[PDB]
Structures are given as C-alpha cells and as structure tokens.
Design a protein around this ligand. Structure first.
Ligand SMILES: [Ca+2]
Ligand SMILES: [Pb+2]
Length: 317
C-alpha cells in the first residue's frame, strides 16, 4: 500500500429513483461482491428523513438501471435508519447490516440476496455511552463500523465533533458485550476528523487502514488515512493532509468532466466479505458519494450520487 494516492473517477453511477418517495440523495454506501453480483446498501436522504435501500447489479455499467429494494418493506422497517455497513459474520453464518437509528444498530439475514429478510433493529448498547454523551458537543452519533480480528470485534463510531470512538467485545459474544468506548482518535478541530470512518485489514501485511472524512479549508469533503499494526491503534498518518490526501478533489482525475468537488462517505471494494473487513493493497477502488459543486441549501436535501474511484498509482494487480 502506497503513502500517496491518485484516482480516476467515474461519472455519477447511482442516484435516486423518480418515484413518490422523492428521495433527494443516495448516500453512505456499503458494498460487497457476492455470487457474481454487486450488493450495495445505501442511505436514502431527503428533508423528511433517512432510511435504507438495497441495490444489486452484475456490472458497473448497469448500476444506474438497477432496481431499488426499499428496506422499510423488510422487518427492518420504517423510521430513521442511516449509513449502513454489510458483512458476513462467518461464525454465525449470518450477514449483518450495521447502521444508526439514534443508537448503534444492526439487522441480520442468512441470505444477502433476500432483502425482505433483514430483521427489525437491535442495538449494540442500551443507550448512548457516557463517554459519547460527554464529548458529543452539538454533534450527532453516526457512522457505525465493525471490524473483527481472530479474537475481538471492534465497533467504531463518530460524533461529528472530532472524536472517533471504539468499543470491543469477543468474537464469540458478538453482537453482545461491547464495552465502554475509548476515544481512538481525536482532533480539537472537528472538521479535521468529522465522520464516516472505514477500518480495514490490509491483506499481505500485519497492518490496518483507517480512513476518515474531513471538511477541508475550502469547505469540501475529503478523506484522510492512517495505518496501524492494531485495530486499537496507535494510528500513524499515511496520506492525511490536504496536499497529500487519501482522496480529495486534488488527487481525483475524471475520464469525463469533473462532476463533484466533494469526495464523501464511501467504502473500498474489499478482498473478502467476512467480519475481518479485508482489502487488497492492489487496484484500490472507492465507492463514494459526490454532488454538483453548485448545490446548496439544507444539508438533508443535497443531491448526493454514488461514483467509483479507480486507483491510478496502483502498486500491483
Ligand atoms: Ca459507511
Ligand atoms: Pb453528516
């Protein structure tokens, strides 16, 4: 894995359907390739609220025409749900879908191909942990992310106030037993460490990759990156500056026209679908949300669409 990045971006691939839901943004994607298809979970966003959608397609050229399965039709149900993470928890032979509902929440499903099967929400904690209540400011508890190694499971989350939190539990007790979070990383400037963590095992190394969204000096979204030998840190900067970013307008080429100046809440294409959240260090691809740089108005109404970054300074195949 290199210490600087360059990318080529697609155009917008996935946006809202034109249906009575009048969804304004498709956001916060999670993605796995399984049995010959892409499986994308995303937030639906509008002024009125958030819920989740499942999208599947064989080929990236067909992503835009893929049908939506609105997950409020499953037991997962209506109400607020946002920012999903899908993975297969191999010891239980169950897929998990992690998201926020005001708490840190999850659904399960034995079959990712059955969107109707996602369970009604359960939570990882009984309420907002004290350390998060104490430090959240007037932020929001968001962007729940699980990664496990051979003995522990970790649950990361953000507060939109410059703190990244981490709880852990044993692999055998998951999803129960998550302890009081510690502050895994923090910045006194919330914009430098804002939301939307990703944490991955880097295949072929004894290292982990942390990505985290920031709001830059130009007001635009971008990603910083760090690595560590442990999921518990300490984290060392990889590409974490505006002049050496993980992903930002200044290291993203477009084959077509530049349709976004923001590189926001995304996920890397993984090398496997299990609870270890592995990536290959080769040919990185980042499924992300962007929007027209002339967009304004209320945050929840912004016209976010999903695109795909393909690494152009790849170290390998
Ligand atoms: Ca996410
Ligand atoms: Pb946000």
């Amino acid at each position: 894995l290199p210490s600087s990045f360059r990318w080529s971006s697609s155009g917008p691939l996935i946006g809202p359907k034109s249906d009575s839901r009048r969804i304004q943004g498709i956001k916060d994607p999670s993605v796995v390739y399984h049995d010959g298809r892409w499986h994308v979970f995303a937030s639906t966003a509008k002024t009125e609220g958030y819920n989740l959608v499942y999208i599947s397609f064989t080929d990236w050229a067909q992503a835009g025409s893929a049908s939506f399965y609105y997950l409020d039709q499953a037991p997962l149900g209506t109400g607020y749900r946002a920012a999903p993470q899908v993975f297969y928890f191999a010891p239980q032979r169950l897929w998990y879908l992690v998201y926020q509902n005001g708490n840190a929440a999850y659904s399960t499903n034995p079959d990712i191909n059955n969107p109707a099967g996602w369970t009604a929400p359960r939570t990882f904690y009984s309420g907002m942990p004290a350390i998060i209540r104490n430090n959240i400011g007037n932020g929001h508890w968001v962007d729940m992310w699980v990664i496990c190694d051979s003995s522990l499971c970790h649950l990361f989350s953000s507060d939109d106030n410059g703190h990244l939190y981490r709880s852990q539990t044993s692999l055998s007790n998951f999803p129960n037993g998550f302890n009081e979070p510690v502050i895994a990383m923090q910045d006194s400037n919330k914009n430098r460490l804002f939301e939307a963590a990703n944490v991955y095992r880097i295949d072929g190394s004894n290292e982990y990759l942390l990505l985290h969204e920031a709001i830059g000096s130009d007001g635009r979204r971008w990603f910083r990156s760090w690595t560590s030998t442990s999921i518990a840190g300490p984290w060392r900067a990889l590409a974490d500056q505006e002049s050496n970013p993980f992903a930002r307008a200044n290291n993203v080429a477009f084959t077509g026209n530049a349709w976004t100046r923001d590189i926001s809440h995304g996920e890397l294409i993984r090398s496997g679908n299990d609870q270890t959240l592995p990536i290959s260090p080769c040919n990185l691809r980042y499924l992300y949300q962007g929007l027209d740089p002339n967009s304004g108005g209320d945050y929840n109404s912004l016209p976010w669409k999903l695109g795909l970054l393909t690494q152009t300074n790849s170290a390998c195949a």
